[PDB]
Symmetry: C2
Subunit: 519 residues, 2 copies
């Protein structure tokens, strides 16, 4: 026979911005059917930025990360009508350009003159190197641009001369020379040797962007996507330096994460435009008002994690850290330990936020109450740290504890636990919290004992705290929870739980290595 | 003059999807340069589905929501080259088709024959061309895993204009199309409080799924078919079942339609594109707010009084506080079984409410503000224990796990959905704005009942009426007033309507909650 399914209303928070005045970006570019570069990468990025995309195809190409198979310039007449009608009926905050033909330049220039002061912002990305085409961009398009984004090879072609890569001052001059020839005040030069230079003509300012050296072949389409990200942010109303920063980071994340989308025959690749996008169906099926789903659709986990190749070297460096050794035999300097508890103090507020989320995700209210006890005691834990820094260390002013600077290892630790708790599920949070419990315990179980620090001291206190039978009992409850999530969690997603366990171990070693290296 | 700015690493949790084996979708369609329909909409929705878009343009058109300005067919050679090179080097899970030319069909057909059974899944969205309808039928459709025509296009495919009286007519059209297209799975769309009606016919299983939708009064339905088929394609690519893929497809589209967007000029009324982007987060927002960012480049008095007198809130605030349910508990005129229903639904509501106050505390600016949320949770759990005692003493519950097995009602579900959504997507001040009405309205509704409580002294009804008229609950209300101010000071002044609207809608949810109990059985 049949079944009847009821379609749900939209998420209530998303219904607050009905008839949204979305920022609009028109891309005037060539195609990359493979979806890596070109007008489709433009639309992907524009979509990924919560902006509305429009197109003006300048050339209909057969393209792949492997090679450019063929190029077919779209006839002037077609380009003209496409741009004309789009602008006659659609809002347009920014126009961004990629691949531009002589006919496309002839059409766009004509429209930029007709529009005058009513013209939208213009992001020009040079797409050259397979003579007059360089001249046409410089003479006809670049004077209207709010920013140009060439790389160094593209710079050499634009000014018809080779320069050098000696230092920053080299790029500085090239950028300034570009502003004079193109009649465009703002210019972003790209060079992974990763360094990006933004020149701001009117204010005669330079902003240098230091990125991350990612060793990957998969950098196809980065140029198209940076220009589209800048254009997207500019359309939203962000400042040029804000939008350029936003663009660079977004591309660099898309590269950093990456995707497996090509056949092994290719072996260069596209980037991950879609790393921040959530899967619609995943929230739709788990929705509270999903009515209904009547038609649609050995042995212990702990020791497995410990002995997994991905976590092994990070776990080993964790439980066998020199910090524990130097504390046991009193070798660790007074100030080194001062940094440790000074840094732990700095985290305690963020620590409390984590466990609030842990309480809210707990499978039963009994487990919630346990998590709110931890949060309820952070107050006194903060005070106990202050009393230790006053009585056993320097009590220079009461305002000392407000002025503590977060270290790199602490910063990375905090960001990681904030991200997993905000973005992940209950078992993913547990997987991240487990190394913190188990790692400390067995680090000092190994250190029993072996305890050379005089009884009654802070060194002695700290060691004995994690070596008591009471802590080992909490460890036993921890080990059980991991084994309980085995029967609750799909085996396909098991590797992610391994990776996060591994990453927390590394972060814990990093937190400890920072304290044994402090001044 | 130069400054150094460091670019942050990607957010740690998002890196877990590194080298993501993304689901790939190749769209073979024409362009709508205005970005509302066609291959751009396809790429938009594929992207919005966290899938990898690919294109094969069969026609280069000039189009806006106003009209089709010009149609320019792409050379058969170009389509061949695009198709041939794409599949040679790219992984492809699913192909979806839009506008197809005689040239495109010829190429695509040949490729489907060459690929045989090792070909990717096919989703055909009929865009209707004397021979085209016949060519789709015989050359393209037998290879499809789903056809998605509208009723007018159903008439173009078989060649007769049928009368759709009820549901059987749609049922038979679906059956007849499957026979001649040779495509088992068919989704008829269109149909007729009003409701949209889409019908999925699963041919192999001789089964129908009827999707009842919420009818939106709007003209902004441009490119709904292109995004539907692309949404379905994206879900199939991820490996979802057809029914799941269709459900999600339809819901995304209707969501895009319901939220909508203002992207056209004033010279363009009575037609508009949809909102493919309603769920996409703005990267910069989380980027500048990130901890390791490492750079740096109104009312007269209390906020509570302003909220409850606001023209948008007043009607729902009144309907909430002056509710007949509260009058019938105090009068003793309410049936016992109905009051039981409320306590049971309330218990379950309080579970979600306790959970969401923990998240409220996690988003609070200072530790002092966090600890106040624990006090609230403690108060919530105290009331749960009172509901626990009520059902054991007054209603004779003896089952140990009766409270874990309570079925949740529509009014409850909606309420829990609202503040869950606000806690996942909104900020701290929006979350608290959402949780305030529950605290305030309960006290005010029952302060209005002292001392007009004519329920027997010592009875359940009377004990319930006193607890929210009590002074200790008044202290919790005073805490609510103070928090409501502390929030207005940190919130962007221009964004204020958002806080009002939230409060207004939660008030509506609470009257619905008491209505449900009032009207139970």
């Amino acid at each position: 026979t049949y079944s009847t399914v009821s379609i749900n209303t939209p998420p209530p928070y998303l219904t607050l911005a009905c008839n949204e005045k979305l920022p609009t970006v028109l891309s005037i570019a060539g195609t990359d059917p493979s979806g890596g570069a070109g007008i489709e990468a433009d639309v992907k990025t524009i979509t990924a930025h919560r902006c509305y995309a429009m197109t003006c195809i300048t050339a209909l190409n057969a393209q792949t990360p492997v090679k450019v198979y063929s190029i077919n310039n779209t006839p002037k007449e077609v380009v003209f009508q496409t741009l004309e009608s789009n602008l006659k009926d659609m809002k347009c905050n920014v126009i961004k350009t990629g691949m531009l033909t002589a006919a496309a330049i002839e059409v766009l220039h004509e429209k930029l003159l007709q529009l005058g002061e009513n013209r939208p912002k213009l992001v020009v990305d040079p797409v050259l190197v397979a003579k007059d085409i360089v001249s046409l961009i410089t003479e006809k398009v670049a004077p209207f641009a709010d920013i140009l984004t060439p790389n160094i090879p593209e710079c050499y072609k634009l000014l018809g001369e080779e320069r050098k890569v000696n230092g920053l001052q080299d790029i500085f001059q090239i950028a300034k020379d570009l502003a004079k020839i193109t009649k465009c005040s703002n210019i972003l030069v790209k060079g992974g040797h990763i360094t990006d230079v933004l020149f701001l003509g009117a204010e005669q300012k330079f902003i240098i962007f230091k990125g991350n050296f990612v060793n990957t072949t998969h950098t196809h389409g980065t140029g198209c996507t940076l220009a589209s990200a800048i254009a997207s942010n500019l359309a939203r109303g962000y400042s040029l330096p804000q939008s350029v920063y936003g663009g660079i980071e977004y591309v660099q994340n898309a590269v950093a994460i990456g995707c497996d989308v090509t056949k092994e025959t290719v072996k260069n690749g596209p980037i991950n435009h879609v790393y921040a996008v959530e899967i619609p169906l995943e929230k739709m099926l788990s929705d509270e008002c999903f009515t209904a789903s009547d038609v649609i659709p050995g042995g212990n986990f702990y020791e497995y994690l410990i002995n997994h190749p991905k976590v092994k070297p990070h776990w080993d460096s964790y439980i066998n850290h020199e910090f524990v050794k130097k504390v046991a035999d009193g070798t660790l300097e007074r100030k080194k330990f001062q940094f440790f508890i000074e840094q732990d103090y700095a985290y305690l507020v963020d620590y409390a936020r984590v466990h609030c989320i842990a309480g809210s995700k707990a499978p039963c209210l009994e487990d919630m109450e346990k998590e709110l006890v931890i949060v309820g005691g952070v107050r006194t834990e903060m005070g106990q740290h202050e009393k230790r820094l006053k009585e056993v260390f320097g009590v220079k002013d009461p305002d000392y504890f407000q002025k503590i600077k977060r270290g790199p290892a602490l910063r990375a630790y905090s960001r990681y636990f904030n991200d997993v708790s905000r973005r992940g599920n209950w078992q993913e949070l547990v997987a991240s919290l487990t190394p913190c419990l188990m790692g400390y315990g067995e680090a000092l179980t190994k250190m029993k004992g072996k305890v050379t620090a005089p009884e009654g001291s802070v060194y002695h206190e700290w060691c004995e705290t994690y070596a008591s039978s009471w802590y080992r009992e909490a460890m036993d409850e921890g080990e059980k929870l991991l084994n309980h999530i085995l029967e609750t969690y799909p085996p396909e997603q098991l590797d992610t739980l391994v990776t996060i366990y591994a990453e927390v171990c590394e972060l814990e070693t990093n937190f400890w290595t920072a304290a044994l290296e402090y001044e």
